[PDB]
Symmetry: C3
Subunit: 282 residues, 3 copies
């Protein structure tokens, strides 16, 4: 039987930094000197509270703003609400999450669970256009009790024309073995719409990307249109019914894929081999 | 317990006008001299019939065309089907709605319920491009029996680059008190795609925007891509789990928000105060 | 009672050709000299295996690549995986499908059923941009056991600015009689986003486009945003609740419809008449 998320409700503390990278980009990290683009994954259970002690190490104002989760206005990360951070300064942002449940009026309160993201809101413009462009974004996962847990989670961000702020024809590639349970967090940012496509695999267009049983009528898809600040996620069994292989993923807007914004889901046999893929050639 | 829609099935009569506004725009109204952009909300119960006596007060042909509802071809509001209205003229359009139910072949007929809209179809071009651009659009809500009813309904239209045909940096803003049940009808028009985003609140991506219970697998979101003539709607509890505040909503396409196509969901305490928002400054 | 799909699980064999058409386009067909744009419909039941003996009759490399269905890497139809076909050559592609079911870990494997499509992947560029532009695309339907079957299926492809590679103002038009069960496969290709809209009819935004009963919360819509390589499908009862008529369908992006990328769903009475439509005028 698969591993499932437990009941949430813990108070968690975390340290985060925004830093200026040597190449001109901007990144978040849990440790000074280890910023990354995309920023590190934040994963919690519904009911958890997260206190993020955030330090802006840059020479310009920056902030941390989150989609989906609960936060008071003092943590929305905007200049308007006095919620951003001065150069060199520190601020504690508080994000909360809640379980679903019956309200007193008989209606159903939705829970926080889902695939979300955080990003800057004050670098370059008052909507963080420069910070987002430079790499100040990252994924957030909120698990409902009983959600299936993966072997591994990969984050794919279509940021303007780039994937994860990388140059054309440099992936990123991800690797799995046939049978691995692989999770994908898909995020889009910037100016353009895109269509995310994966070869050889498919998922359900609902909250978790998977179907619990025969009664769920959601569309099963391998192609999905997205726009700036859209986020969704899903799980696949690597190679299920299709075998090992170098399975492309890409934006399917034809000029975008033609520019080289493509990557590989390298699904291996146990011996590491991939049919039709020769390592000493890529 | 919350208020819910009753069983429908009434014949309703209504008067509507299309008018040329002093500033060059075009608007619908229920009373001559009270046209608005967006046009007034039309709200009915599944099963209702609506007879709209429509007068074109303009000096060009205009029409009324509706999404989603039942209408015979004599009420589709197009030039091709002889269904538009000459300058100064009057025409009675008939819109019908139906409840869902079992067909004789055992399949399930969907009902009319949902978030829809009406707009012009002959001003400027034979697809109403000029009429839509000038402001001839408005919302329609069809309620299913038992649908939860809100305290108030607001209409947000992304029309080309504008929100509700307003200049940049002029909202519109909407107001609520913490705990109000607020309904949003979201409509998009024109040439461009957008992504609607609200700070501090979220909803379900299904027919009503809310979940009835734990079995609904729909994605819970705060960001949604839309295109011309898309319509959706939802309800939120103002400030639920997040408190009072000036909560932004905006298109999240970065250049669109940078141009100032943003507004505020001003959620107040009972005393009218909003933390971090000073009235004598906006 | 309506006709429903039976249990699948047959091995099917098929012959397909890619050909260069006299007007400069490129098309797939089941018979040499009978290529079409869109290519012919491939329709199977979940569990079926399809062996397609594909001959490239053109003077450039071409391939066959499919969305959604199961295929080993030797049938993905790409140059990278040595899976395309040389001029004049032949290759057998194998597509498989599977039923949904319970995995050993207790989770639910989704089935192949849905609305999918096939297209070229090596003409013009290594993502088939030229082949797709020239007309190398077609629809695939995979039926689940018990899926409702239509009287007829029509394929509408928004390919760049064209519908089905046709010039503006040339449809295509489709015909039905009031009460026919009509299926639409909607596919989008190329560079642009679109919004598909039909007058006088609506469908459910889920896997099959129809609701099985009162518990399905999916949005009922008549307008839907799409991007390159998106596919969805649905069924309608022609004229249900609205009667005979020339019911437009079009992209609702205003400049796209203004250019003439529109068609007619001609719903007739038994005597062939259509109110407000005069044949000797179109
Ligand atoms: Cu914002
Ligand atoms: Cu793209
Ligand atoms: Cu593909
Ligand atoms: Cu955002
Ligand atoms: Cu129309
Ligand atoms: Cu926008
Ligand atoms: Cu936000
Ligand atoms: Cu319309
Ligand atoms: Cu591909
Ligand atoms: Cu279009
Ligand atoms: Cu319409
Ligand atoms: Cu494709």
């Amino acid at each position: 039987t698969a591993r499932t998320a437990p009941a949430g409700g813990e108070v968690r503390h975390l340290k985060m930094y925004a830093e200026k990278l040597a190449d001109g980009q901007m990144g978040y990290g849990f440790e000074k000197g280890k910023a990354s683009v995309p920023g590190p994954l934040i994963e919690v259970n519904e009911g958890d509270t997260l206190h993020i002690e955030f330090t802006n190490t840059m020479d310009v104002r920056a902030s941390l703003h989150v989609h989906g989760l609960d936060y008071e206005i003092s943590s929305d990360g905007t200049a308007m609400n006095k919620s951003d951070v001065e150069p060199g300064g520190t601020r504690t942002y508080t994000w909360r999450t809640h379980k679903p449940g019956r309200r007193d009026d008989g209606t159903w309160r939705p829970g926080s669970a889902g695939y979300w993201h955080y990003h800057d809101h004050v670098v370059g413009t008052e909507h963080g256009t420069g910070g987002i462009r430079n790499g100040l974004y990252g994924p957030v996962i909120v698990r409902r009790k009983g959600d299936v847990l993966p072997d591994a989670t990969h984050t794919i961000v279509f940021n303007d024309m780039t994937i994860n702020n990388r140059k054309p024809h440099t992936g990123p590639d991800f690797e799995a073995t046939v049978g691995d349970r692989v999770e994908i967090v898909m995020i889009t940012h910037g100016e353009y719409y895109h269509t995310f496509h994966m070869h050889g695999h498919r998922w359900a267009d609902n909250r978790t990307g998977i179907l619990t049983g025969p009664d769920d009528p959601s569309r099963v898809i391998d192609n999905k249109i997205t726009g700036p600040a859209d986020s969704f996620g899903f799980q696949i069994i690597a190679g299920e019914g299709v075998g090992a292989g170098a399975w492309m993923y890409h934006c399917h807007v034809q000029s975008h894929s033609d520019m080289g914004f493509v990557g590989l889901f390298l699904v291996k046999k146990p011996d590491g081999t991939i049919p039709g893929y020769e390592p000493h050639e890529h």
